[PDB]
Amino acid sequence: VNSFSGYLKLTDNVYIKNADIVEEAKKVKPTVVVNAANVYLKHGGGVAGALNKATNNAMQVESDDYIATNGPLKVGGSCVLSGHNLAKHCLHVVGPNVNKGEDIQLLKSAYENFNQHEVLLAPLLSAGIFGADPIHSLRVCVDTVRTNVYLAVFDKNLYDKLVSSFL
Numbered sequence: 001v002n003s004f005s006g007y008l009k010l011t012d013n014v015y016i017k018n019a020d021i022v023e024e025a026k027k028v029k030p031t032v033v034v035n036a037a038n039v040y041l042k043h044g045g046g047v048a049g050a051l052n053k054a055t056n057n058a059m060q061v062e063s064d065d066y067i068a069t070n071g072p073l074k075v076g077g078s079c080v081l082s083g084h085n086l087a088k089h090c091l092h093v094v095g096p097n098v099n100k101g102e103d104i105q106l107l108k109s110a111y112e113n114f115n116q117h118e119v120l121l122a123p124l125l126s127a128g129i130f131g132a133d134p135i136h137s138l139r140v141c142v143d144t145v146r147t148n149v150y151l152a153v154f155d156k157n158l159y160d161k162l163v164s165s166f167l
C-alpha cells in the first residue's frame with residue numbers, strides 16, 4: 001500500500017486521479033515525479049512551469065547546469081534530476097510536441113522511460129500545451145508502461161472524458 005489516495009484503477013498497473021500533479025507531489029512526496037519536459041529543460045509553462053514554480057525556480061537552476069554540461073535531451077528521452085521539495089527525484093521526460101510537427105510515434109519511446117522506475121507520479125505526456133490528443137496519450141501509457149504509474153490530470157472535464165472513454 002502506498003500513500004496515493006483517491007485514485008481510480010484503470011489497469012493492473014495504471015491509476016488516475018483528478019488533481020494538480022504539483023499538489024499531489026507535495027502531499028505524497030513520491031520517489032519519482034515525472035515532468036513534461038522539453039529538450040532544453042526550459043520549464044516555462046504547462047506542467048513544467050507549474051512544477052518549477054513550486055520549487056521556487058530551483059528546478060530551473062539545476063536544469064540549466066545539466067544542459068550546460070550535457071547538452072539537450074532527445075525527443076523521447078529523459079534524465080533524472082532532483083525532486084527538490086516535491087519528490088525524491090524528478091524524471092524529466094520529453095514527449096513529442098505536435099504543434100512543432102514532432103513524430104507522435106516518439107510518444108511510445110517517451111513512456112518507455114517510465115519502465116526504469118517501479119512507481120511514478122506522472123502527467124499525460126505530449127498532451128496539454130504539447131498539442132497531442134490526451135485520450136491517445138493515456139492509451140499509449142497503458143500499452144507501454146509496465147511499472148506502477150499514478151496519473152494526475154488537473155482538468156476535471158478532461159479527466160471525466162478520459163475515464164468515460166476508457167474500456
Ligand SMILES: CC(C)[C@H](CO)Nc1ncnc2[nH]c(-c3cc[nH]n3)cc12
Pocket residue numbers: 019020021022046047050123124125127128129134152153154155158
Ligand atoms: C497535461 C494535461 C493533459 C493536463 C490537463 O489537466 N495538465 C496537468 N495535469 C496535471 N497536473 C497539472 N498541473 C497543472 C498546473 C498547475 C498550475 N499550473 N498548471 C497542469 C496540469
Ligand SMILES: [Cl-]
Pocket residue numbers: 045046047127128129130
Ligand atoms: Cl499543459
